[PDB]
Amino acid sequence: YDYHFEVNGTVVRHKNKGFGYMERFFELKESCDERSKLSKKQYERFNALFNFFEKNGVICMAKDAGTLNTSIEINSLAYHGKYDVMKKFIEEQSVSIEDDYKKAFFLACLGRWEESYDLYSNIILNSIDESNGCVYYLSQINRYRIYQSITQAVTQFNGLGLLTFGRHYKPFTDEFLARIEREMTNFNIDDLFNGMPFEFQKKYKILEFLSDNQFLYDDTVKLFELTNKVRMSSDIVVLLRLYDNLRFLYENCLWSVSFHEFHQYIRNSMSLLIEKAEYERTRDIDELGFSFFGKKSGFFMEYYDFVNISRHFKIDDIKNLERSCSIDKIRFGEQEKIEEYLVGIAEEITKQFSANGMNVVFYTQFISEAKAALYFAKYVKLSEEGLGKIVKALLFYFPERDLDIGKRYVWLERLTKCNELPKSIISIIDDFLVLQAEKHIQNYSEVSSNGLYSRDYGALIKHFEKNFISKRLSEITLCLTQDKQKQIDFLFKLLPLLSTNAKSHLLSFKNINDLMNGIRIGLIDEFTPEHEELIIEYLETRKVNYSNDYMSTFGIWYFLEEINNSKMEEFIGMDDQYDFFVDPENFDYKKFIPSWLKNYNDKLLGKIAGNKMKHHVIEVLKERVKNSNDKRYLEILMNYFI
Amino acid sequence: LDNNVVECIKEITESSRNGKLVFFVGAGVSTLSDYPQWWRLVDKYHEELYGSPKKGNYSSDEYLRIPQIFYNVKGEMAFDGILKDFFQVDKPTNPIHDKILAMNPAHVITTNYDNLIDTACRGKYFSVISAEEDVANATSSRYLLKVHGDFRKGFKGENVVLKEDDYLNYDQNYPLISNLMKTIIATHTIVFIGYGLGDYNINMLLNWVRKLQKDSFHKPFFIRTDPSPIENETLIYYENKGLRIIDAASLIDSNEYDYLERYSAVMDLLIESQENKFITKDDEVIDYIYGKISPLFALQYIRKIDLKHVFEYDYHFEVNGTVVRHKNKGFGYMERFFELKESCDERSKLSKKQYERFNALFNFFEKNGVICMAKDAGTLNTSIEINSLAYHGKYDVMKKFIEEQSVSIEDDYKKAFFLACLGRWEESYDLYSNIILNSIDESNGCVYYLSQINRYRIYQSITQAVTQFNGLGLLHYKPFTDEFLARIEREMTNFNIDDLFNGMPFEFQKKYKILEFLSDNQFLYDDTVKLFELTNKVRSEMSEGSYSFGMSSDIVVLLRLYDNLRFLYENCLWSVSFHEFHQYIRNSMSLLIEKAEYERTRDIDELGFSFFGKKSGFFMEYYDFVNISRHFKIDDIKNLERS
Amino acid sequence: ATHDLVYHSKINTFVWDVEFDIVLSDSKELNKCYFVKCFNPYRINGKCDFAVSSIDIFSEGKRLLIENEFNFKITKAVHVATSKDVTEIVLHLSERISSPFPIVKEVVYLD
């Protein structure tokens, strides 16, 4: 406690009551005439200390401050996820014990926990001499952590989640589990530091907290400051402390980076930082000026922040970040390095799927990062080649058991929002849907969770490319027969993409139920007079009959100016919805209630917004908002009716 | 099993958990690894000296007389050559070595001259002492005391006690090692292994322990592994001489030529019983619960969460008052205790002292609000009540309470807290010093620790106030005696707060385990992480517009809040002074107010479920109001008014 | 126990832990089945465009093809987790709302 070392790279005297050795040292390093008064051994010791302080980013006192660069960089290969480099470095022969330690950490990071444990045991056995316990000690810690992880995996893997092939293959054998339990039957880590030689305890006092089960309590507690609503900056100090912690944990090859506590700390820090930035921006724009502040948030985030977000965030946390602190108004950083990261992770997932030699633990530890990365890749401008590679990896080589058709449709649609659709990805999507048609050949059925299917893809293509024609589907459907029905069903589900000849050919392959089924998916897009006559007959049958909601769709259809018939005025008398959708001028609005208002889509609400019953709906929305502060009612009022 | 054996096992386990176990490893353990015994060398010397062997004339003294004759006749080089020839082999370690190391002994004293017990430590660091100069360069605080001169320095015969003359001049040759052995034996708890009941070393040690006073030693344990079950008279005589004997025989039984199985059975029994707590009927359950609870009686109130630390993660404790089995494999004392609490009839099956201790435990659990388990939990109602005068804010009350003389040290501690919250920090420091000085007497020491922490806290408070509040708007009062500002400096200079708890009696570190968290910000992290997570969840429900018709999550937050405040105020602690606590309280209350405001308005509640019932509702009382007025700033109040 | 019940705002629906033994029209009796609703207001639909939320019905966890949507024959509701005939409340609540389907297992927010 002699000196306070502020995170920005400065020092200050705090409780030094003796000679100011820090000031003398920094004066000696500042000038050249200060040197040459010291012996050769002192000269080389000062040179080594200067090099160490340069590598550690310590500059000078706060009096001689001004424009501190504070540029961070981490040169640990495992951080950047260059897995091929770790794979090639593992097989290479190791020279010294430090290379063995780094190899053990790399093996642990790759899911080969067996070899990591054996290597740690061998390292502990070999090196016990000298005051280099700084390796030995750390080795023990890593080993213990690995063991903990191993047992946790077991009690999480063989206990639940039988969806994996077999009984999860039992990734670790039972004999090794018994040996693990035998070697660590009563190992206590809290007394590891005390038993080591007293000179080690004197020198390496700073490494004590590693043996504790919790060591991020101080930063997590200090995170409270960002919630201060009152009017260096605390964002700078918090972010720099986070970078310091990440650099220390990753550069020294410590396994404690793979625990839940660190992930929770990372998520809390990032979420609080983004919340503070957005709150400050919104308060400034509300108070200072509508566009004087520029309406752009000052929190720039870069490659390091993106990789941290990808690594340590789950899906729902990113969902919270986007719905509360929307990032579309946040500007990115260097897009090129982000593109390199994305192409690397896509290459990794492609290799993992293709080689078929998957490892369950690495599977679980990596696809979380993968899904986070692809989900967050929406906000980055990406070149055509990177887009093609990412789509190729995601559409085909992403395993079914984690990503289904519906969520893959989410990812792809979310990816191009700002990336557009050059010819390449339309070609690759056409290839994917052609392959899907091939696999439809039967006891086969697509599974989705969000109720979406492959047809959406074609619609999206038709949304972006109206004139595109898929020839391969035409070739498939020319040879198509009627023995197998599911394939032609998929063919009508992809009707617009086909050519006129294919459409005419399939038209030969197909009461009010038939018309309703065709119109639900939209095969008979037009309204032929025969269909209108069937409509009249069904309405007359209902009227002479006089409750599922099937006829209100017909009033909606007439409201869409798609039914050119004058007999809809004579079939009213039961439902207020039909009268409103056919004769709104004479309609009684006492029976009108806004429950159906939350069911129409953009086109219907836009059409009804400009139609002139507008005062009736405006007063209905007024009263509904007054009695209850429903988000949907106020939102629809603002976006459509104002 | 025999009751005395159970008692010995319990004492050995208790000593092992406290790091006060020392193993006296004999020569039979090294024999199990097929190490060449001494009698082989004796016979070889007999052969090389005379020319023929004879087993019949091999008494106890011959084992030392024959090598001495060989050394005195043939010389020294022949002795070293024979020793090198017969002791250069290397042998694998024993499972018994791993079993003894797995008990975590503080020191290991061995009379062997082998390397097996060393090469067995696997990843354990021991400072090996086998000579005279090695006791001065002890690099660590854990001793592997090879009493009889290991062969590390070489295979010469002058480095090990084998012949008779060396045994005669042992005290004159090895004073330091003998003194160290006797000190270790007097301090820690000794467990012998691999020794014959008639061996020379045991007899010498008994002769030495005879000279000691009748009391003032811990009777060493002797684990005997011999084919013949021991006799009653020999056992009683050796117990009278000062040993407690546990015999491997009469427990497992085997043939005459097998030795590994008996050692294995004894060590497996010890290791298995280490984690197990010997609980059979209700009396043991209540005794153990009282033993692990009673030190907490000094504090007025403790929060429910850190209870999970007292029981060593044996039972997850929820804020609402329910408990859930987490890492318990034994009798399940919580289940039986709850059954005893529910059923009045079974309370008559306990002895009077156990009945009184159970009554005290039940009262303590009722004050803490622990209700029952999760399955038996129905409609649980929790009241909020704090008995701190300073919390309510009737300053005349503790003014006229500090006016007069107190009656006990705890009363003085209350006076110190009241003075600290009354602004007279000088008198607060003076009376805290008076307390820590008037406390030379204590059966617990908790008051001493708490007073030291509070004194350091108020010291930092006055230092920060003096240093910062000088140009903040003061312009000068900063009123304190000039000598006082240097007295606090020189006095509270070397006093480090991180190592405070590490320097307290070994039982205090075992009983008041939770209080360590008071020395730092630790006592907030475990709760603030949950607060952040629940904040995120509640805001997600806020954004999606979902309405919950069951029980809301916010109650959990609320409970934690109140508990924290009570634990900080009923114990009269100055830690409520910092701004971290204020920020935490402010965040929790902002969350609660926002959630209540959102739950105030609904759409379908009236039409529909309203007939079934109505649980929704939120209310500010006295407590909420005082907390708002104390732990909030004006701008945040304006912000929440706007929101 | 109505803890499961979660009521939404943008769709005005219920989410329970129950299961339905629906009977289809024309005396077509069905086994246990359940509903799943997915809300998507940004769908770029075609000429047939009225609904924002897609409702799907699955029997035994398998997608059941829908041709005649005439399942106005009530059901016997069983609270899948605790297995209780919540059916009476099921009607109590379905007769009190205008939504065609009052209870779904969960609502998927694609928006």
Author numbering:
A (entry chain A): 336 to 566, 578 to 787, 789 to 857, 861 to 896, 909 to 974, 976 to 1005
B (entry chain B): 22 to 142, 145 to 498, 503 to 670
C (entry chain E): 10 to 120
Sentences from the paper on this structure:
The defense-associated sirtuin 2 (DSR2) effector, a SIR2 domain-containing protein, protects bacteria from phage infection by depleting NAD+, while an anti-DSR2 protein (DSR anti-defense 1, DSAD1) is employed by some phages to evade this host defense. The NADase activity of DSR2 is unleashed by recognizing the phage tail tube protein (TTP). DSR2 is arranged as a dimer of dimers, which is facilitated by the tetramerization of SIR2 domains. DSR2 has a two-domain architecture, with the CTD responsible for sensing the infection signal and SIR2 acting to prevent phage propagation.
We therefore reconstituted the DSR2-DSAD1 binary complex and determined the cryo-EM structures at resolutions of 3.4–3.6 Å. We modeled four DSR2 molecules and two DSAD1 molecules into the EM density. The tetrameric DSR2 displays an elongated shape, with two DSR2 dimers forming a head-to-head tetramer (the four molecules are termed A, B, A’, and B’, respectively). Although each DSR2 dimer binds to one DSAD1 molecule, two binding modes are found in the context of the DSR2 tetramer. The second binding mode involves DSR2-A and DSR2-B’ molecules. However, these DSR2-DSAD1 trimeric subcomplexes in the two states are nearly identical. DSAD1 is trapped by the tip of the CTD fishhook. The H4 subdomain, along with the H3 subdomain from the adjacent molecule, brackets the β-hairpin of DSAD1. Notably, Tyr16 of DSAD1 stacks against Tyr574 and Phe576 from the adjacent H3 subdomain. The H4 subdomain moves outward by ~10 Å to accommodate DSAD1.
